[PDB]
Amino acid sequence: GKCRGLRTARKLRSHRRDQKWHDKQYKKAHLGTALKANPFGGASHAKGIVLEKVGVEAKQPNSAIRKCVRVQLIKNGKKITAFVPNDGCLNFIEENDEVLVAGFGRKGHAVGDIPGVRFKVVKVANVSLLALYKGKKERPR
Amino acid sequence: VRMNVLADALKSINNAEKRGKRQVLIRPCSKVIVRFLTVMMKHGYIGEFEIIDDHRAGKIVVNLTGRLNKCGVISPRFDVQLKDLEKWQNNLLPSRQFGFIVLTTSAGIMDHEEARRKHTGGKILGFFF
Amino acid sequence: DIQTERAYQKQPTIFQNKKRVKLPRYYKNIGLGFKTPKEAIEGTYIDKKCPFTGNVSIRGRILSGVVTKMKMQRTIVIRRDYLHYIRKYNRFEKRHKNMSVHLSPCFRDVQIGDIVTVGECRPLSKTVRFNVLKVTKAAGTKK
Amino acid sequence: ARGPKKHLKRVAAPKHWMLDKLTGVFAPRPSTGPHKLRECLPLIIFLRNKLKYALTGDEVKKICMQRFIKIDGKVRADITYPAGFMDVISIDKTGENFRLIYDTKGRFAVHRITPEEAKYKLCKVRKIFVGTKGIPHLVTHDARTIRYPDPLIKVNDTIQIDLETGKITDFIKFDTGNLCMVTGGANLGRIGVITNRERHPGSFDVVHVKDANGNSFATRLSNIFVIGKGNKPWISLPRGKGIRLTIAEERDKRLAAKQSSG
Amino acid sequence: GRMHAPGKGLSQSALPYRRSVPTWLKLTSDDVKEQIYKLAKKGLTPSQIGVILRDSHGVAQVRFVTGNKILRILKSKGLAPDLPEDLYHLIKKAVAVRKHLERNRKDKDAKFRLILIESRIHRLARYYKTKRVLPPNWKYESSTASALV
RNA sequence: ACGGGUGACGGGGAAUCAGGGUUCGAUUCCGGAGAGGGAGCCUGAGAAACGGCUACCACAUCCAAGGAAGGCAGCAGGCGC
RNA sequence: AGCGUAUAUUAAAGUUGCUGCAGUUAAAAAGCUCGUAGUUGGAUCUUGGGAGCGGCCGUCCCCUGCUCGGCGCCGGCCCGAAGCGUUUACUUUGAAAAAAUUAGAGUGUUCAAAGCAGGCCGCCUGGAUACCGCAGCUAGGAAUAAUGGAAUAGGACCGCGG
RNA sequence: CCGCCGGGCAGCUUCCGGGAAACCAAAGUCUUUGGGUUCCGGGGGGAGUAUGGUUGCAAAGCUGAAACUUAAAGGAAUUGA
RNA sequence: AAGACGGUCGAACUUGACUAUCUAGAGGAAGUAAAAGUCGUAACAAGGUUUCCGUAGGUGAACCUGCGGAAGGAUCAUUA
């Protein structure tokens, strides 16, 4: 506090009210644009149709290919690169399959060495990727 | 300009104590200062003091002992209710054992101990510990 | 002097055609220790909405502001000042609420800056619900 | 709301009924009558919950439709009839008479009275009035209109009425140094002697009351009932005699009687 | 510090403790009052009356010799000039700067210093308005400020 | 102030908490508003009521093709999302 | 008998700072003065007295006047009541404040979450209490901070012409 | 020439004290946190850009975002090359 | 009783006007991320013309030059 008068309440309050906009997280929440620009539109997961598979080349010192898949959301029609996590999980995901898509973890920020991939696949046509990987469920033929 | 007189009186005592002086000169004396310093003296943080009397605002020469750590003002003078003495003296004072909050009540100017004793609120002026 | 409007202005309670061979006046003390002032009893004005010489009963609140504007017909704007207390910062903020209040021609000379006491009555107009009951001339104002 | 409301939820029911939560959604909304909805005791509540004569609302219906229960010397075949303060509930076949006056705490006690005491009641006059021929009129706290009263009775007095004739016998003037039971607010059921009345033109006048043990408390004039002249109540009181001792004293008395039982 | 300057000058009077009039002074309350009347009627400000007394006649302070302040003597007698003798001097200076500035047009410094003096006139004029030394209608306006001498 | 925005029905309350606080409160209690969108009314103490009526706008059922009948944000349940 | 993940949000965050942050060089002081709202403004007006009791010490009570009754006393003294007494914030008290939730007293739902029940050989018992900002109401206190009174004397009081 | 007082531009010196330090009698009297008040900062970019407004003849000035990208950018001081 | 004149409340329709949002977009123009391309070498050592600032002109390109600043300089200093 700088001004300390016993009736400087609207001053201290109005000052703080204005200066909270300079906070990066506050503004990102309280302005519309972040939510308006977010492909999920402020949701936990989202279902989307697989339209092709894509090999994303990893970042620097790391040298590998990432088993990403290009997905179109049902509710928006926005197009999304979703990372299929575990070792050779891309073989259970064929095209025109609807997938359930989560965020990666960092709340709309690219995770690890995978350049510009926010999302990851968790289900493939009402079957968990963990289930199809560990051999608990088979794909519905 | 000089807007708080008790603020400068207590800061000048504090610097004199830290520096290790035996006595200090307070320039513009007032009832509130003399009533603050009598509360200090009554517990025995300062010795005697002599208010030098020109035809203006007086001056005070206070006999410092070396048993005062800090004497500070609280501006603005907030309206301390009786149920708020605890949460004031919790964060202002060093311990629950020593230190005092002098606050101006209807009765007069006195510490949190006597304000609790007489069952009275008032306004915080400062603290000494 | 009076009877400027097209309809005949009279205190409708007093009857002024008693055969014989001064006009009388109806008034009232409006309670709560307010002295029915001299102009109420010894004036010749007509007012529906005067608390003394009219049909309004004072009941509910008794508030007080300072006279701000006197530019409308038998009505004035008072300005009521108070300190609203914000809780987070243990400090106040200076607020105001100015209300249109009915001034009787009873109180002959009030100056903008005078202190007024107002009594709640029934709704008199769109925004008027209070009546001027006593005026206290602002600090000095002798000359 | 497009008209008057008929259902009263169990959580909205006045607290002095002491209705449990897990019984139902509703409580008996008292039918309109002499006393207010908030401040009555419905006949189903008094008969089933307090006395425990009935178990269900259907059992109370089966009692009250045999013309057994008589409220203020008249048969009341309405199970949610509002029985309020000072009201005299006489059951003839059992041979028992109750006067609904407050416990020392803010609730109705179940105070049994004698056959000879259950023949009258005290009514607080609410407004005096002149009719259509200079015939003076009273209105009491229990909605009774009494015409041709005693010409001294005024707006805050108490009258003793007879529950056959409905006529005024004797009255207690509202004075300083008269017993008053407090029938509203925090001090609900406190009996004490009127010490002072403090006039506020336009506001509610506050009245200072002195308990037997030197406990002084104020109440608004509306929530006071003059129940006796001097220290002599013209009715019988519950056990406690309206003192409302502190929680530390109630504990001491409880575990005193407990340890004495052993 | 000074109102319209960066200076922090400490130079003013220092009155002694003893308010008692000394023994050598033979001038009584009425003698100095006759002297003050004569000086004011000659045409002289309360300031210049005060210095004339202490320099020549040896009157330490008039508030101790008399019981009054020079202006309260003069305004009781009805010799007090209407608009005060500091408001007067600020207007007189402001007219003197503007008369210079009307000729020497590129004097950007005189323009700045005129703004400072006028800010001081307004600020003292409103003090006198609240304290009822001036009418509420009193105006400082450079159009007809020279009408005030 | 006026205007604009709200993923705004309000409150009792809820989550988190050293002391301050920040965020939530569609949701069983109180108050309000609405019965697909607006508007108009009959009857009655109380309704601008929709498990009342009369129009128009959107949708929509049954037609011997002239006509008849609609209103789930009641309890279940169906599609869509 | 549960644990992992995604997202909104709280603490961590003294990284929104009223309590409580920083502004030479890490992000940051308008180029410079003027200036109305806003915010904040020096000192100064009651100190000092009567008497009680425990071990020079400690606390208890005593500080403005002008019409109807009895503790009575002899038109009086006393006590009381209905009125009066620069405003305002502040502080303490009282009233008025729906339940439910929360805090919280009682009680072995077998314990516990809950529940408002129960207990003793017909009787005996509970169903408490606190908390509820701010605004409004009411009664004490008068330190602190605003505000008013006589200065063209149209001043207070006291009496006489009226 | 020798000293004293008050305002000003600076200097030297010290374990006043502070600071991440370089250093500063102020950048001190700060967890022992409150003398008064104005402006203003919130990881680096995108960008003082786009857009709207306003001022100017023009150049341009004042006010001023977002999507998106990123794990550092940076400050003082140390030891090497 | 049907029916009619007028008033009234007034949905809704007709033609224009503005404006809140969705959206195709020839084409233009930037910023960004991209394991080794090209042309240089503007900057960091006085970086080979000390560097940076405001403004104006110029140029494949980093940039260059004019006028006035700043040391965050490569001088805390240069003697009668």
From Swiss-Prot, chain A:
Segments of this protein annotated with the region Disordered: 1-25
GO MF assignments? structural constituent of ribosome
- Pfam families in alphabetical order: Ribosom_S12_S23
Q: What is its main location?
A: cytoplasm
Enumerate composition-biased segments (Basic residues).
1-19
Keyword tags? Acetylation, Cytoplasm, Endoplasmic reticulum, Hydroxylation, Isopeptide bond, Nucleus, Ribonucleoprotein, Ribosomal protein, Ubl conjugation
PTM annotation (N6-acetyllysine): residues: 134
Q: Which PROSITE patterns match?
A: RIBOSOMAL_S12
Which residues are recorded with the post-translational modification N6-succinyllysine?
A: 53
GO biological process, any: translation
Function of this protein?
A: Component of the ribosome, a large ribonucleoprotein complex responsible for the synthesis of proteins in the cell. The small ribosomal subunit (SSU) binds messenger RNAs (mRNAs) and translates the encoded message by selecting cognate aminoacyl-transfer RNA (tRNA) molecules. The large subunit (LSU) contains the ribosomal catalytic site termed the peptidyl transferase center (PTC), which catalyzes the formation of peptide bonds, thereby polymerizing the amino acids delivered by tRNAs into a polypeptide chain.
Protein name per UniProt: Small ribosomal subunit protein uS12
Please give the organism.
Answer: Oryctolagus cuniculus
From Swiss-Prot, chain B:
Output the InterPro entries linked to this UniProt entry: Ribosomal_uS8, Ribosomal_uS8_CS, Ribosomal_uS8_sf
Which parts of the chain are coiled coil? none
Tell me the Gene3D superfamilies matching this sequence. 3.30.1370.30, 3.30.1490.10
Q: Which residues carry this modification: N6-succinyllysine?
A: 87
> What PROSITE patterns does this protein map onto?
RIBOSOMAL_S8 (PS00053)
List GO molecular-function terms, semicolon-separated. Answer: structural constituent of ribosome
Q: Could you state one GO cellular component term attached to this entry?
A: ribonucleoprotein complex
> Example GO biological process term?
translation
Q: Where in the cell is it found?
A: Cytoplasm; Nucleus, Nucleolus
Keywords, A to Z, come to: Cytoplasm, Nucleus, Ribonucleoprotein, Ribosomal protein
Predominant cellular place of this UniProt entry's protein: cytoplasm
Which purpose does this protein serve, as stated in its record? Component of the small ribosomal subunit. Part of the small subunit (SSU) processome, first precursor of the small eukaryotic ribosomal subunit. During the assembly of the SSU processome in the nucleolus, many ribosome biogenesis factors, an RNA chaperone and ribosomal proteins associate with the nascent pre-rRNA and work in concert to generate RNA folding, modifications, rearrangements and cleavage as well as targeted degradation of pre-ribosomal RNA by the RNA exosome. Required for proper erythropoiesis.
The entry assigns this protein to a family as follows: Belongs to the universal ribosomal protein uS8 family.
Task: Tell me how this protein assembles.
Answer: Component of the 40S ribosomal subunit. Part of the small subunit (SSU) processome, composed of more than 70 proteins and the RNA chaperone small nucleolar RNA (snoRNA) U3.
Q: How is this protein named in the record?
A: Small ribosomal subunit protein uS8
From Swiss-Prot, chain C:
**Keyword rRNA-binding belongs to the record:** yes
Record's PROSITE patterns? RIBOSOMAL_S17
Positions where N6-acetyllysine occurs in the chain: 28, 35, 48
Kindly list the positions at which Phosphoserine occurs in this protein: 57, 100
GO CC term (a single one)? nucleolus
Q: Which UniProt keywords apply?
A: Acetylation, Citrullination, Cytoplasm, Lipoprotein, Methylation, Nucleus, Palmitate, Phosphoprotein, Ribonucleoprotein, Ribosomal protein, RNA-binding, rRNA-binding
Residue(s) carrying Omega-N-methylarginine: 59
Q: Which residues form a coiled coil?
A: none
Matching Pfam families? Ribosomal_S17, Ribosomal_S17_N
Molecular function per GO? rRNA binding; structural constituent of ribosome
Annotated compartments: Cytoplasm; Nucleus, Nucleolus
Q: How is it modified after translation?
A: Citrullinated by PADI4.
Location (main, coarse): cytoplasm
Q: Where is the lipid attached (S-palmitoyl cysteine)?
A: 50
Residues recorded with modification Citrulline:
20
Q: InterPro entries recorded for this chain?
A: NA-bd_OB-fold, Ribosomal_uS17, Ribosomal_uS17_arc/euk, Ribosomal_uS17_CS, Ribosomal_uS17_N
| Annotated GO biological process | translation
Similarity comment: family membership: Belongs to the universal ribosomal protein uS17 family.
Role: Component of the small ribosomal subunit. The ribosome is a large ribonucleoprotein complex responsible for the synthesis of proteins in the cell. Part of the small subunit (SSU) processome, first precursor of the small eukaryotic ribosomal subunit. During the assembly of the SSU processome in the nucleolus, many ribosome biogenesis factors, an RNA chaperone and ribosomal proteins associate with the nascent pre-rRNA and work in concert to generate RNA folding, modifications, rearrangements and cleavage as well as targeted degradation of pre-ribosomal RNA by the RNA exosome.
Tell me what this protein is called. Answer: Small ribosomal subunit protein uS17
Supply the source organism for this entry: Oryctolagus cuniculus
UniProtKB/Swiss-Prot annotation, chain E:
Q: How is it modified after translation?
A: Ubiquitinated at Lys-26 by RNF14 and RNF25 in response to ribosome collisions (ribosome stalling).
GO molecular function, one example? structural constituent of ribosome
Q: Which residues does this entry mark as bearing Phosphoserine?
A: 29
Give one Pfam family: Ribosomal_S15
Keyword list (alphabetical) reads: Acetylation, Cytoplasm, Isopeptide bond, Nucleus, Phosphoprotein, Ribonucleoprotein, Ribosomal protein, Ubl conjugation
Primary site of residence: cytoplasm
Entry-annotated residues carrying Phosphotyrosine: 37
Glycyl lysine isopeptide (Lys-Gly) (interchain with G-Cter in ubiquitin) crosslink, residue number(s) = 26
Q: Which residues carry this modification: N6-succinyllysine?
A: 26, 33
The answer on whether this UniProt entry bears the keyword Ubl conjugation reads yes
| GO CC term (a single one) | nucleolus
Sequence position, cross-link Glycyl lysine isopeptide (Lys-Gly) (interchain with G-Cter in SUMO2) = 42
Which biological process, per GO, is one annotated for this protein? Answer: translation
Q: Where does this polypeptide localize?
A: Cytoplasm; Nucleus, Nucleolus
Residue positions, PTM N6-acetyllysine = 26
> NCBIfam families in the record, alphabetically?
PRK08561.1 (NF006331)
Q: How does it assemble?
A: Component of the small ribosomal subunit. Part of the small subunit (SSU) processome, composed of more than 70 proteins and the RNA chaperone small nucleolar RNA (snoRNA) U3.
Q: What family does the Swiss-Prot or TrEMBL record give for this protein?
A: Belongs to the universal ribosomal protein uS15 family.
State its role. Component of the small ribosomal subunit. The ribosome is a large ribonucleoprotein complex responsible for the synthesis of proteins in the cell. Part of the small subunit (SSU) processome, first precursor of the small eukaryotic ribosomal subunit. During the assembly of the SSU processome in the nucleolus, many ribosome biogenesis factors, an RNA chaperone and ribosomal proteins associate with the nascent pre-rRNA and work in concert to generate RNA folding, modifications, rearrangements and cleavage as well as targeted degradation of pre-ribosomal RNA by the RNA exosome.
What protein am I looking at? Answer: Small ribosomal subunit protein uS15
Organism whose genome encodes this protein: Oryctolagus cuniculus (Rabbit)
